[PDB]
Amino acid sequence: SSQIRQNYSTEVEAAVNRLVNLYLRASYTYLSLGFYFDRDDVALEGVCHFFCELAEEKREGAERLLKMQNQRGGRALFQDLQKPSQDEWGTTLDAMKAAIVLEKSLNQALLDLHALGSAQADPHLCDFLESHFLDEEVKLIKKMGDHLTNIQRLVGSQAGLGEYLFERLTLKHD
Amino acid sequence: SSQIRQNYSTEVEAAVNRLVNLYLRASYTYLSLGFYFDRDDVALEGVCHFFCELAEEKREGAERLLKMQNQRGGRALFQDLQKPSQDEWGTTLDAMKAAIVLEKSLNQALLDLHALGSAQADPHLCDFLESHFLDEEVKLIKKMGDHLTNIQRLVGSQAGLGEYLFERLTLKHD
Amino acid sequence: SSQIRQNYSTEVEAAVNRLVNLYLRASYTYLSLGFYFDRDDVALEGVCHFFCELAEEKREGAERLLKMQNQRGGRALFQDLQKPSQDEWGTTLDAMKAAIVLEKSLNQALLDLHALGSAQADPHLCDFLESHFLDEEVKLIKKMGDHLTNIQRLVGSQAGLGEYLFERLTLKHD
Amino acid sequence: SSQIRQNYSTEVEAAVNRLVNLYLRASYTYLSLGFYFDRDDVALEGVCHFFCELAEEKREGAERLLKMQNQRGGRALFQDLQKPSQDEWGTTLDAMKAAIVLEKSLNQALLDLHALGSAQADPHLCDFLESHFLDEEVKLIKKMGDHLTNIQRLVGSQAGLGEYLFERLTLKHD
Amino acid sequence: SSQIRQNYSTEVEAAVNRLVNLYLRASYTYLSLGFYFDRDDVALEGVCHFFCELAEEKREGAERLLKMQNQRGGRALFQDLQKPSQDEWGTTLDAMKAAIVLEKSLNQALLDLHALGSAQADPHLCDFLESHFLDEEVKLIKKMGDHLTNIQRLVGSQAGLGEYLFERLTLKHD
Ligand SMILES: [Mn+2]
Ligand SMILES: [Mn+2]
Ligand SMILES: [Mn+2]
Ligand SMILES: [Mn+2]
Ligand SMILES: [Mn+2]
Ligand SMILES: [Mn+2]
Ligand SMILES: [Mn+2]
Ligand SMILES: [Mn+2]
Ligand SMILES: [Mn+2]
Ligand SMILES: [Mn+2]
Partner E contacted by C2 (CB < 8 A)? no
Residue A27's closest CA among A93, A109, A99, A112? A99
Residue of D nearest to A131 (CA): D131
Nearest to E43 among C149, C157, C165 (CB): C149
Contacts with C63 (C-beta within 8 Å, 6 or more apart), sequence order = A31
Residue of A nearest to D128 (CA): A127
- Taking the centre of ligand 10 as the mean of its atom positions, its distance from the CA of residue C21, in whole angstroms, is 38
In this complex, do A164 and B161 lie within 8 Å of one another by their Cβ atoms?
Answer: no
Listed resolution, Å? 1.4
Q: How far apart are CA A169 and CA A14, in angstroms?
A: 44
Q: Which ligand is nearest to the CA of B44?
A: 3
First to last CA, chain E: 47
Among A47, A157, A161, pick the best mutation site for testing chain B contact (most B Cβ within 10 A). Answer: A161
CB C64 within 8 A of CB C132: yes
Whether A6 contacts chain B with CB within 8 A:
no
Q: How far apart are CA C172 and CA C150, in angstroms?
A: 15
Residue type, E156: G
Spatial CA neighbour of B130 closest among C6, C123, C12: C123
Look up the CATH number of domain E1-174: 1.20.1260.10
8 Å CB contact between E50 and E172: yes
3-class DSSP string for chain D: CCCCCCCCCHHHHHHHHHHHHHHHHHHHHHHHHHHHHCCCCCCCHHHHHHHHHHHHHHHHHHHHHHHHHHHHCCCCCCCCCCCCCCCCCCCHHHHHHHHHHHHHHHHHHHHHHHHHHHHCCCHHHHHHHHHHHHHHHHHHHHHHHHHHHHHHHCCCCCHHHHHHHHHHHCCCCC
Closest ligand, as measured to the CA of D51:
8
C-beta separation of D30 from D51 below 8 A: yes
A138 to chain D, any CB pair closer than 8 A? The answer is: no
Instruction: Verify whether the Cβ–Cβ distance C70 to B142 is below 8 Å.
Output: yes
Distance separating alpha carbons of residues C50 and C35, to the nearest angstrom: 11
φ and ψ at A21, to 5 degrees?
Answer: -55, -45
Please tell me the number of Cα atoms within 13 Å of B61 on its side-chain side.
30
Q: Which of residues 41-70 of C touch B (CB under 8 A)?
A: 70
> Looking at beta carbons, which residues of chain C come within 8 Å of D152?
160
Would you call A2 an interface residue with chain D, using a CB distance cutoff of 8 Å? no
Q: How far is B79 from chain A (nearest CA, A)?
A: 36
Q: What phi, psi does B169 have (nearest 5°)?
A: -105, -20
Q: Minimum-distance ligand to the CA of D43?
A: 7
Q: Which of C142, C148, C153 sits opposite E160 (nearest CB)?
A: C153
Rounded distance from Cα C70 to ligand 4 centre (Å): 30
**Angle, vertex CA D91, rays to CA D87 and CA D96, nearest 5:** 85
C-alpha C153/C-alpha C165 separation (Å) is 11
Report whether B96 contacts B28 (CB < 8 A): no
Q: Does E137 touch chain C (CB under 8 A)?
A: no
Phi/psi of residue E135, each to 5°?
Answer: -75, -30
- Cβ–Cβ under 8 Å, residues D28 and D84: yes
Q: Which residues of D touch A64 (CB under 8 A)?
A: none
Sort E14 into a burial class: Cβ within 10 Å, 0-12 / 13-18 / 19+: middle
CA separation for the pair A80, C83 (Å, rounded): 4
Q: Which ligand is nearest the CA of A52, by number?
A: 2
**C-alpha A172 to ligand 1 mean position (Å):** 11
The Cβ of residue A51 has, within 10 Å, a number of other Cβ atoms equal to 22
Integer Cα distance of D132 and D134 in angstroms: 7
User: Cβ neighbours of residue E68 under 8 Å, at least 6 residues apart?
Assistant: E16, E128
In this structure, which amino acid lies at residue A10? T
Do residue A127 and residue D134 have CB atoms under 8 angstroms apart? yes
Q: Which amino acid is at A84?
A: P
CB under 8 A, 24+ apart: contacts of E121-130:
E121/E7, E122/E7, E122/E8, E122/E9, E122/E12, E124/E7, E124/E72, E125/E8, E125/E12, E125/E72, E128/E68
D124 vs A131: CA distance, rounded Å: 15
Q: Tell me the C-alpha distance between A172 and A51, whole Å.
A: 11
d(CA A143, CA E167): 56
Residue among A106, A97, A98 nearest A24 (CA): A106
Identify the CA nearest to E44 among candidates E151, E144, E140, E137.
E151
Instruction: Please state whether E14 falls in left (phi above 0), alpha (psi between -120 and 50) or beta.
Output: alpha
Count CB-CB contacts under 10 A for residue C138. Answer: 12
| CA C79/CA A75 separation, integer angstroms | 26
Residue C81 — φ and ψ, nearest 5°?
A: -100, 115
**How far apart are the C-alpha atoms of E1 and E75, rounded to whole Å?**
7
Q: How far apart are CA D41 and CA D51, in angstroms?
A: 17
Secondary structure letter of residue C87 according to DSSP: S
* Cα-based angle B128, B129, B135 (whole degrees, multiple of 5): 120
Contact partners, residue E120, CB within 8 Å, separation at least 6: E9, E11, E12
Ligand 4 centroid to residue B31 C-alpha, Å: 7
**Using CA of residue E21, residue E26, residue E27, residue E29, what is the dihedral sign?**
positive
Interchain CB contact of A89 with C (< 8 Å): no
> How far is the centre of ligand 4, averaged over its atoms, from the C-alpha of B55 (Å)?
9
Instruction: Establish if C169 touches chain A: CB-CB under 8 angstroms.
Output: no
In angstroms, rounded to a whole number, what is the distance separating the alpha carbons of residues E31 and E48? 9
Q: Determine the Cα–Cα distance for residues D116 and D125; give it in Å rounded to an integer.
A: 9
Q: Which chains touch B (3 or more CB pairs under 8 A)?
A: A, C
As a three-state string, the secondary structure of B27-88 is HHHHHHHHHHHCCCCCCCHHHHHHHHHHHHHHHHHHHHHHHHHHHHCCCCCCCCCCCCCCCC
HEC sequence for C131-169? HHHHHHHHHHHHHHHHHHHHHHHCCCCCHHHHHHHHHHH
Residue C127, chain E, CB below 8 Å: the answer is no
CB contact under 8 A, D170 and C165: no
- Cα(D135)–Cα(D51) distance, integer angstroms: 19
Would you call C127 an interface residue with chain B, using a CB distance cutoff of 8 Å? yes
**Alpha helix locations (H) across C8-91?**
10-37, 45-72
Closest CA to A59 of A83, A33, A23: A23
The DSSP code for C81 is: B
Q: How far is the CA of E31 from the centre of ligand 9 (A)?
A: 11
CA distance D124 to D16: 13
Are B27 and B19 a contacting pair, CB within 8 Å?
Answer: no
Q: Is any Cβ of chain C less than 8 angstroms from the Cβ of E40?
A: yes
Neighbours of B6 (CB within 10 A): 8
